[PDB]
């Protein structure tokens, strides 16, 4: 019962290719997730919009696909609606709006990959907890 690299192997892109994170990246992502996400995304939900969660399946049915490193990283730079037919960087933290969301100023490409990895690894560990809310607490 441990965090094996077998667990830290998450899909990199849409074309099946995967990437293996390290215990250093995980913790770092986890720390960065608290720094800039937890405020609204504590435990994989969304307080200011509970209809959309951070479940891998939810991210898979997003448009474009956000159930991989490439997807999520793109989102953290230029976020869109679930259908992608609208850019929401003005009312959502991102690189192209770091002036509006100061927390996003420090964040570097290394940081973005870590946070993305965290979102894909947590449900591998927590399961239903990561998606659901108080019901699974």
Partner 1 sequence: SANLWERFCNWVTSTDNRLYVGWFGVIMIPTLLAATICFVIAFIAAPPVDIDGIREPVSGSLLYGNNIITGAVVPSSNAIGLHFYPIWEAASLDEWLYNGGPYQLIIFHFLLGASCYMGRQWELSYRLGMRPWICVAYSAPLASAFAVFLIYPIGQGSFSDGMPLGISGTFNFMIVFQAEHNILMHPFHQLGVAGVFGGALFCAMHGSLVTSSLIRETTETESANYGYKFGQEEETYNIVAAHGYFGRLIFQYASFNNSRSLHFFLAAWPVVGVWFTALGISTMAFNLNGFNFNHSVIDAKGNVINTWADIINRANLGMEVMHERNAHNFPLDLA
Partner 2 sequence: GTTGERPFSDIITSVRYWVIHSITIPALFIAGWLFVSTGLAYDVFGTPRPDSYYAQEQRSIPLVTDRFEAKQQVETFLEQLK
Partner 3 sequence: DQESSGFAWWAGNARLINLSGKLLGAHVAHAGLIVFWAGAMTLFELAHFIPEKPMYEQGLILIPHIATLGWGVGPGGEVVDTFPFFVVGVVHLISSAVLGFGGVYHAIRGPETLEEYSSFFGYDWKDKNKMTTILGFHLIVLGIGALLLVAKAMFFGGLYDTWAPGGGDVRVITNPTLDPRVIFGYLLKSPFGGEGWIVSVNNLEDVVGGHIWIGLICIAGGIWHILTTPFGWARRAFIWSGEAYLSYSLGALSMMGFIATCFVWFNNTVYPSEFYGPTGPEASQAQAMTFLIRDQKLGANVGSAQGPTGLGKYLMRSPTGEIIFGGETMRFWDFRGPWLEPLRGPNGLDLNKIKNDIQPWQERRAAEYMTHAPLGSLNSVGGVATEINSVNFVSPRSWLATSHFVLAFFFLVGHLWHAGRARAAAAGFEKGIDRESEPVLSMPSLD
Q: Are 71 and 59 in contact (CB under 8 A)?
A: yes
Q: Of the candidates 117, 118, 136, 116, which has an alpha carbon nearest to the alpha carbon of residue 128?
A: 136
What's the length of the chain? Answer: 137
Q: How far is the CB of 68 from partner 2 (least distance, A)?
A: 23
Q: How far is the CB of 132 from partner 2 (least distance, A)?
A: 15
Cis peptide before 64 (omega within 30 of 0): yes
DSSP 19: E
Contact call for residue 39 and partner 3 (CB under 8 A): yes
Contact call for residue 135 and partner 2 (CB under 8 A): no
Q: Are 69 and 113 in contact (CB under 8 A)?
A: yes
Contact call for residue 91 and partner 3 (CB under 8 A): yes
Contact call for residue 4 and partner 2 (CB under 8 A): yes
Does 118 show up as a binding residue in the annotation? no
Residues that bind partner 3 (CB under 8 A): 34, 38-40, 42-43, 47-49, 90-92, 100, 102-103, 105-106, 134, 137
Residues that bind partner 2 (CB under 8 A): 1-2, 4, 127
């Amino acid at each position: 019962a441990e965090l094996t690299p077998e667990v830290l192997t998450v899909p990199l892109n849409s074309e099946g290719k995967t990437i293996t994170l390290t215990e250093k990246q995980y913790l770092e992502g986890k720390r960065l997730f608290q720094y800039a996400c937890a405020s609204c995304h504590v435990g994989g939900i969304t307080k200011t919009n509970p209809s959309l969660d951070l479940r891998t399946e939810t991210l898979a049915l997003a448009t474009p696909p956000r159930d991989n490193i490439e997807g999520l990283v793109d989102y953290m730079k230029n976020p869109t609606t679930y259908d992608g037919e609208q850019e929401i960087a003005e009312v959502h933290p991102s690189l192209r709006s770091a002036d509006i969301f100061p927390k996003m100023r420090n964040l570097t490409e290394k940081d973005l990959v870590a946070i993305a990895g965290h979102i894909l690894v947590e449900p591998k560990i927590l399961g239903d907890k990561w998606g659901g809310g108080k019901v699974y607490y």
